[PDB]
Amino acid sequence: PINVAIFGSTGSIGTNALNIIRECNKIENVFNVKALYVNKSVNELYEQAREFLPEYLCIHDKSVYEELKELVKNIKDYKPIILCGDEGMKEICSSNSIDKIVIGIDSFQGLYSTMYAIMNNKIVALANKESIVSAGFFLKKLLNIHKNAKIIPVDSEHSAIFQCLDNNKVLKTKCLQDNFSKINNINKIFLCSSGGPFQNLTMDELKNVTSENALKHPKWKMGKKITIDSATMMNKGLEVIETHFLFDVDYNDIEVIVHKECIIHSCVEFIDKSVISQMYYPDMQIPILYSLTWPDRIKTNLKPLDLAQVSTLTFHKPSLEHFPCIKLAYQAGIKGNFYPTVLNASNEIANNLFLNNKIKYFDISSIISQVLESFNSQKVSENSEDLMKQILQIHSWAKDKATDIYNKHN
Amino acid sequence: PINVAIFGSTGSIGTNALNIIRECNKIENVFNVKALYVNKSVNELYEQAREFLPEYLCIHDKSVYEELKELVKNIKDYKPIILCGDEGMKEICSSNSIDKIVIGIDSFQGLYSTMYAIMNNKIVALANKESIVSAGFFLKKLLNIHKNAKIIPVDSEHSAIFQCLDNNKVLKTKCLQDNFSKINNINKIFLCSSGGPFQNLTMDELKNVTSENALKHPKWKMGKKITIDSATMMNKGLEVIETHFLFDVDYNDIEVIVHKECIIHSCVEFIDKSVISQMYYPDMQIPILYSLTWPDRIKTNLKPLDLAQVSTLTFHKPSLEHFPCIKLAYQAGIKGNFYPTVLNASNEIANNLFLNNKIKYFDISSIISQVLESFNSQKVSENSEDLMKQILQIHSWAKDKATDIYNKHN
Numbered sequence: 001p002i003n004v005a006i007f008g009s010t011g012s013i014g015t016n017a018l019n020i021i022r023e024c025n026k027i028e029n030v031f032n033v034k035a036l037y038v039n040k041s042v043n044e045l046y047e048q049a050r051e052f053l054p055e056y057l058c059i060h061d062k063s064v065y066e067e068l069k070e071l072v073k074n075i076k077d078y079k080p081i082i083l084c085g086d087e088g089m090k091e092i093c094s095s096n097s098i099d100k101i102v103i104g105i106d107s108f109q110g111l112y113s114t115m116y117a118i119m120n121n122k123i124v125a126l127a128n129k130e131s132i133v134s135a136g137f138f139l140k141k142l143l144n145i146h147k148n149a150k151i152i153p154v155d156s157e158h159s160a161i162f163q164c165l166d167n168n169k170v171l172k173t174k175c176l177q178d179n180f181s182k183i184n185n186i187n188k189i190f191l192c193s194s195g196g197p198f199q200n201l202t203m204d205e206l207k208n209v210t211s212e213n214a215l216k217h218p219k220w221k222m223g224k225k226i227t228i229d230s231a232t233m234m235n236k237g238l239e240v241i242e243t244h245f246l247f248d249v250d251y252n253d254i255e256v257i258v259h260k261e262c263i264i265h266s267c268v269e270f271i272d273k274s275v276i277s278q279m280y281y282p283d284m285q286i287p288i289l290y291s292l293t294w295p296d297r298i299k300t301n302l303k304p305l306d307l308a309q310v311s312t313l314t315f316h317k318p319s320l321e322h323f324p325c326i327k328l329a330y331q332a333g334i335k336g337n338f339y340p341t342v343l344n345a346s347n348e349i350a351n352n353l354f355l356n357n358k359i360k361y362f363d364i365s366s367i368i369s370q371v372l373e374s375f376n377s378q379k380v381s382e383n384s385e386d387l388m389k390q391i392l393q394i395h396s397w398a399k400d401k402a403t404d405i406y407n408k409h410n
Numbered sequence: 411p412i413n414v415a416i417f418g419s420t421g422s423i424g425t426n427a428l429n430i431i432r433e434c435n436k437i438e439n440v441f442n443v444k445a446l447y448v449n450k451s452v453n454e455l456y457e458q459a460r461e462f463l464p465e466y467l468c469i470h471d472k473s474v475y476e477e478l479k480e481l482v483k484n485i486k487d488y489k490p491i492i493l494c495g496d497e498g499m500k501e502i503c504s505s506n507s508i509d510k511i512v513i514g515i516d517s518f519q520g521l522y523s524t525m526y527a528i529m530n531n532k533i534v535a536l537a538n539k540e541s542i543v544s545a546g547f548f549l550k551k552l553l554n555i556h557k558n559a560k561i562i563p564v565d566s567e568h569s570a571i572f573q574c575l576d577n578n579k580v581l582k583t584k585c586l587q588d589n590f591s592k593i594n595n596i597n598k599i600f601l602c603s604s605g606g607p608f609q610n611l612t613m614d615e616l617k618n619v620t621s622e623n624a625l626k627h628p629k630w631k632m633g634k635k636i637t638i639d640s641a642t643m644m645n646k647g648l649e650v651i652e653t654h655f656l657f658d659v660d661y662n663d664i665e666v667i668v669h670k671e672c673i674i675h676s677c678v679e680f681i682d683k684s685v686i687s688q689m690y691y692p693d694m695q696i697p698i699l700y701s702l703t704w705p706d707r708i709k710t711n712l713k714p715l716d717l718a719q720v721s722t723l724t725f726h727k728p729s730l731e732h733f734p735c736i737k738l739a740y741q742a743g744i745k746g747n748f749y750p751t752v753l754n755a756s757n758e759i760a761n762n763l764f765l766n767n768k769i770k771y772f773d774i775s776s777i778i779s780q781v782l783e784s785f786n787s788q789k790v791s792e793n794s795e796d797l798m799k800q801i802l803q804i805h806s807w808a809k810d811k812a813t814d815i816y817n818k819h820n
């Protein structure tokens with residue numbers, strides 16, 4: 001039985017993880033949910049605690065710790081270890097009774113739990129792409145220290161790539177490891193995207209888009225941050241850099257394709273030019289389940305893909321004029337150093353400004369571009385404690401710079 | 411280096427095999443063409459002999475054997491072993507210098523070289539689907555005796571399936587073995603078909619189609635027999651039975667899907683419901699190459715798949731009323747025993763009759779249907795020699811029965 005912790009259990013990823021775990025457990029007891037960790041959602045965490053009865057409960061926001069302990073007392077035949085903040089998160093990661101950890105915490109904040117899970121040689125089912133984008137080089141370093149840890153990608157495109165690969169070769173390397181793509185005979189990656197809600201808008205129409213309309217994603221139901229990112233295709237931009245770090249694929253070998261039906265989740269071209277792709281309905285349960293079962297697969301009762309009913313699959317190039325965020329991500333990635341950290345941080349600020357109706361669509365990339373331009377390359381610290389400190393400092397600088405740029409205009 | 415023999419070297423597969431061997435060798439020298447074997451095409455065998463200079467040459471037709479020896483003398487500094495008929499084939503198969511054999515001989519005839527390559531524990535790169543259809547359970551028995559022999563599928567759809575699997579699971583088993591699909595966690599196969607040239611025709615129009623028009627395949631350039639099979643979709647019916655044998659997939663788990671673009675070559679649904687597909691332009695060089703490099707891949711200079719340019723991929727259910735050969739194949743496969751032998755034999759006759767303008771489109775399925783109904787279940791011989799004799803007897807019986815039915819109607 002696979003012992004799992006779910007970090008960000010009450011969010012979009014975390015709810016889907018519990019969904020597929022529940023359905024798989026119907027027949028055979030395959031997963032034991034040992035731990036659940038949220039920020040503030042006490043009532044929803046208690047409802048999940050009632051169903052899954054995990055050994056550990058943890059809430060990041062200490063102000064709702066008492067509320068949680070109180071609700072939980074109403075559950076019969078149950079004495080969980082109820083924990084708090086970073087200290088709680090670190091205690092969960094250090095537990096011998098947890099094998100795999102799903103990271104469904106959003107934004108840069110997800111990096112902390114990712115780091116600690118790795119330091120405790122856990123299997124990390126990583127949905128949080130921001131951590132790879134802001135700290136890819138650091139994570140590679142960390143994984144070469146903690147040799148029994150692994151990152152297994154949960155992001156659907158990266159799970160798709162992972163699945164298309166031959167496990168006979170995947171097993172001889174590790175995500176983030178040097179030469180991953182060489183060992184796997186990868187020539188290039190087609191990173192598939194729904195294209196978001198604004199794919200058919202003209203330049204003049206785009207100028208005027210609002211966050212209410214950005215939140216109406218045509219294919220995926222997700223948290224607010226990634227949903228806004230999908231509308232600007234900054235999501236895809238972050239995923240380009242994520243592809244580079246996870247799979248050691250050169251930036252010139254990663255191609256973004258708009259596939260509006262979202263059935264094909266990504267494709268791998270091998271050195272012989274044969275292409276392999278993974279397909280399913282747009283549904284995070286598959287990539288989540290795969291991260292927890294890899295290198296095996298288990299039976300589900302999910303709806304089978306009906307190719308005949310789907311009928312048509314379409315593909316086109318994205319316009320970099322209409323979606324300049326993609327261009328900025330490639331540029332930041334190609335530059336290397338801490339440019340991805342600065343990209344991620346400034347986007348977190350610009351994404352949230354747009355969400356809250358403070359700026360326009362094209363201001364998002366304008367703010368990001370300006371922060372990237374302002375940043376000066378830094379010497380990369382050789383030890384991991386120093387490097388994490390350096391990452392946090394640059395991430396914090398970039399966020400303040402973005403806000404400063406916003407403050408100067410509006 | 412990889413030591414390869416090409417059986418049926420002057421046909422469509424054989425030429426494509428030499429083509430990709432030649433072009434890959436230009437990048438890096440990995441293939442040594444050790445033997446070529448044809449039926450009657452003395453002059454083109456001679457011409458190939460000059461370019462590749464194989465150690466062995468064989469021609470099945472004894473009446474052009476001396477003519478071949480005459481022609482080959484013209485090649486300076488070249489002393490090959492020149493052979494003929496069944497004897498020469500067996501000598502090539504038994505040679506310790508040959509590792510892999512591409513079987514590109516057409517029809518039931520392909521069985522003889524397939525079975526002897528297996529008997530000699532070779533890697534059999536098998537394109538000839540007729541051998542599997544008529545002798546599937548016998549080849550199964552033979553591969554259980556000769557444990558180092560392997561069939562690696564070359565048929566594009568079956569190569570596609572094979573490319574989608576994880577080789578750490580494949581290497582625990584092999585093609586044409588019981589439990590292959592269970593070991594690989596395969597739930598279901600989507601077998602893709604171009605649909606052939608008659609996909610948009612009414613029942614009334616189909617009654618009057620000719621072989622001249624049937625030979626104008628929209629997507630694949632092939633030999634005459636398979637091309638006619640593609641027009642009636644009997645090719646796909648044979649491929650259903652081929653899938654069942656190679657991968658041990660139940661007939662109720664094989665779906666035929668019409669995919670006119672012929673970019674997706676087939677898809678594998680795993681037990682978690684994830685689907686993996688292999689994709690390329692309709693070009694037999696990829697499946698041929700993979701059969702010779704498995705479990706690795708090598709660099710090629712083939713044109714890369716451009717999904718944006720392709721733009722649209724379509725999928726729909728085939729019409730069974732318009733393509734009754736599909737139904738017949740399913741029925742024969744489900745019956746098991748020697749019904750697939752009978753299906754294959756009667757089709758070889760009916761296919762040839764239609765090719766030479768002797769019968770109409772729906773007479774093909776009528777003849778096969780009538781031969782299948784004529785046949786009665788026969789006890790399966792225990793020893794392999796008697797089972798092989800039995801397959802020959804039945805095959806020969808079914809050809810004669812199909813000819814008799816034609817002769818009474820004419």
Ligand SMILES: NC(=O)C1=CN([C@@H]2O[C@H](COP(=O)(O)OP(=O)(O)OC[C@H]3O[C@@H](n4cnc5c(N)ncnc54)[C@H](OP(=O)(O)O)[C@@H]3O)[C@@H](O)[C@H]2O)C=CC1
Nearest residue numbers: 008010011012013038039040041060105106127128222223
């Ligand atoms: N949703 C999706 O389909 C996909 C998501 N992703 C990635 O997965 C990650 C999560 O996304 P998504 O599920 O959409 O986001 P949500 O906003 O829906 O969920 C975020 C979760 O993280 C929790 N959380 C936030 N801060 C902390 C913290 N400090 N400590 C513990 N828990 C915390 C939240 O708890 P609380 O409820 O208490 O606020 C919530 O449970 C993102 O990084 C995203 O990029 C990637 C691909 C697809």
Ligand SMILES: NC(=O)C1=CN([C@@H]2O[C@H](COP(=O)(O)OP(=O)(O)OC[C@H]3O[C@@H](n4cnc5c(N)ncnc54)[C@H](OP(=O)(O)O)[C@@H]3O)[C@@H](O)[C@H]2O)C=CC1
Nearest residue numbers: 418420421422423448449450451470515516537538632633
């Ligand atoms: N063509 C294709 O793209 C595909 C083909 N297939 C399968 O591959 C097989 C070959 O098809 P294809 O290449 O189109 O057929 P072709 O008719 O083009 O070629 C047949 C080849 O087999 C040779 N041959 C026939 N009998 C003998 C024999 N007694 N001994 C030695 N050689 C013999 C012929 O020799 P000769 O030239 O002297 O007559 C010829 O070279 C078929 O079984 C088909 O089902 C499967 C998938 C795709």
Ligand SMILES: O=CN(O)CCCP(=O)(O)O
Nearest residue numbers: 156193194195196230235
């Ligand atoms: O993996 C899932 N996502 O990242 C959401 C995909 C949305 P997009 O293709 O529109 O970015």
Ligand SMILES: O=CN(O)CCCP(=O)(O)O
Nearest residue numbers: 566603604605606640645
């Ligand atoms: O593998 C290649 N073929 O079998 C030829 C495919 C022809 P079809 O898709 O029309 O059956």
Ligand SMILES: [Ca+2]
Nearest residue numbers: 163164165167
């Ligand atoms: Ca795989």
Ligand SMILES: [Ca+2]
Nearest residue numbers: 373374375376
């Ligand atoms: Ca500067």
Ligand SMILES: [Mg+2]
Nearest residue numbers: 155156157239
């Ligand atoms: Mg994604």
Ligand SMILES: [Mg+2]
Nearest residue numbers: 565566567649
């Ligand atoms: Mg085929």
